[PDB]
């Protein structure tokens with residue numbers, strides 16, 4: 082039989098059923114309405130799979146998208162691919178304890194204390210065991226968003242390659258907080274040959290105090306880069322400085338955000354460029370010298386890309402993993418072509434990148450930036466809070482199998 | 492004093508004055524009006540400079556821009572940087588004979604039969620030591636457009652690093668035809684670590700029958716790539732196949748060209764996607780299999796970039812070296828970010844790339860695609876014809892020091 086939340090059977094004993102915070106197609110909408118607790122069967126691991134008892138789960142805006150069914154209903158998408166399930170168990174971040182392994186799992190063991198990286202693909206696909214990068218495979222996707230059986234169940238299912246050793250000095254909730262956003266940032270900063278962060282490179286980080294940005298600042302700093310954070314208030318600015326940013330830029334000081342004027346609109350271009358230059362000058366002011374960012378860590382998309390493209394150094398890279406302000410990103414070729422800049426899409430993580438990121442966490446070089454811990458019961462409200470901009474600063478987590486806060490250190 | 496066009500002094504004897512097809516600021520406008528023949532003082536080569544007697548000169552659209560003063564007048568622009576000259580001698584492609592060398596020239600000698608690559612920068616600038624590539628330096632620019640003393644004078648001036656050995660099996664006019672566009676295309680296809688043409692890569696080449704496109708097709712084929720040419724009519728298409736394109740696509744079959752609808756415009760995006768999809772299927776048809784181009788060789792810019800970004804393979808690169816239809820390039824982040832695509836600006840060439848490209852010419856692996864030969868007297872009319880619909884497929888040249896056609900083979 083199932084067990085209560087905040088408890089588990091003996092290690093390696095798996096119940097038939099589990100509790101999960103579930104979405105169904107018939108209740109898509111706001112998170113408060115779309116999420117409901119249900120009991121479902123615990124899945125059995127197949128070849129190469131690992132069943133993890135979730136001790137804590139991290140929250141992400143991807144769960145707001147899955148709850149709303151925008152841009153897609155994930156359930157309907159998987160049904161079109163042959164899935165029998167009519168529910169979605171999200172959650173893309175977890176810490177916990179391995180409770181079962183399938184055939185061919187020769188490294189990970191029952192009882193291991195682990196975290197889960199989000200880079201999901203079929204380990205047995207031809208393109209995965211060959212092509213450039215497993216994240217380019219046909220099967221590549223984000224665990225717990227594109228896949229079912231994520232961290233909002235008492236037990237989650239992942240492939241072996243997603244399993245990482247849990248940092249010993251972190252609690253369950255601390256360890257559950259950063260991996261999705263941290264590995265995403267790590268691939269962005271270290272994954273694109275020709276434009277990886279080097280010592281003394283200036284790195285412009287949008288949304289510096291958010292989950293992605295706070296990991297990016299730390300990763301850049303550990304690489305010997307000089308991070309500059311863009312933020313929405315002074316407190317967030319000082320938070321970013323405390324994580325290693327040399328300084329911050331307050332976005333509210335500018336009003337040019339959005340799609341730029343067409344290149345033929347001379348009057349509009351004059352006004353837009355004066356704003357962009359002023360933004361660039363604040364970078365110079367923080368550095369104490371006229372240097373441009375070699376790497377720009379993007380994610381706002383439509384409203385910021387024009388500034389990113391403009392400020393990026395000659396021969397530099399704007400790398401982007403979302404479009405939170407919209408997807409119609411205008412690239413002015415008079416900057417992008419003549420000064421030979423790179424606009425790089427980046428998504429997920431491969432295993433080498435995830436392990437390298439996790440090694441920084443494990444060694445105590447990176448802070449997981451846990452802001453806020455909620456109960457399993459509050460997944461819907463917590464994502465409602467997220468959508469309404471109301472979460473405390475910091476990555477947010479829920480307890481699942483953990484009986485209380487501040488457990489799990491070794 | 493000066494010698495006639497179609498003649499030279501003995502090798503190494505430099506006259507005081509030379510004929511040139513010159514633009515002046517008081518006559519900017521259409522090429523037919525802007526270019527006029529004048530005599531000017533032959534420049535004295537300074538440190539690191541080489542004076543080349545021009546035997547033939549290649550034509551390029553950059554000369555139409557210079558004639559018009561778009562985006563700026565190059566004469567006024569150089570005067571603001573300290574230049575004394577009130578005239579512009581364009582021409583960014585030359586074959587000829589070295590007639591003089593300045594101080595500190597190491598390898599190039601008087602009498603050498605040469606061609607000139609377009610990658611111009613100050614060899615004694617710090618950054619040309621400390622930037623990652625000399626084309627990223629502050630002084631990096633295009634010879635004969637951004638610089639004076641190009642190939643439309645009887646003698647032209649270049650830095651030593653621009654000098655290449657002229658292919659022995661080519662005439663003066665053949666050898667003068669391809670270097671600007673060929674080296675540009677070489678840098679695009681081989682110069683961007685992470686996304687260089689590999690055996691069996693599909694390569695989509697815009698404007699296939701043009702100078703750049705016809706070199707790109709051949710470069711891609713030499714690297715074991717599979718080129719697909721976009722063209723404006725059937726004959727251009729067949730021309731592209733004879734250079735090694737597996738097949739061609741006629742752009743006039745397609746009414747979606749231009750800036751795309753905004754991402755929130757549902758109905759606009761259905762129609763736009765249907766055409767982009769059909770464009771994609773033409774690729775697959777030519778290939779006989781459902782594969783996407785790993786590399787897209789761009790330059791039309793504004794009107795084609797949405798299609799390029801859409802068709803580009805997961806993890807692939809769209810590389811762009813102009814914006815002939817305009818500069819406001821809209822990148823849909825739903826393709827670009829999620830399928831991890833690269834949009835790479837590229838401009839000019841470094842010396843390693845230029846030599847590698849020229850090696851292909853020298854060894855007879857690449858055709859310079861000489862389409863038409865005109866007289867020095869007709870620079871203005873030839874660029875007028877270029878600006879209008881006229882001029883043949885591939886590359887046009889003029890004779891300068893060569894007394895007649897088909898000379899210069901060794």
Ligand code: NA
Nearest residue numbers: 581582583635
């Ligand atoms: Na020129």
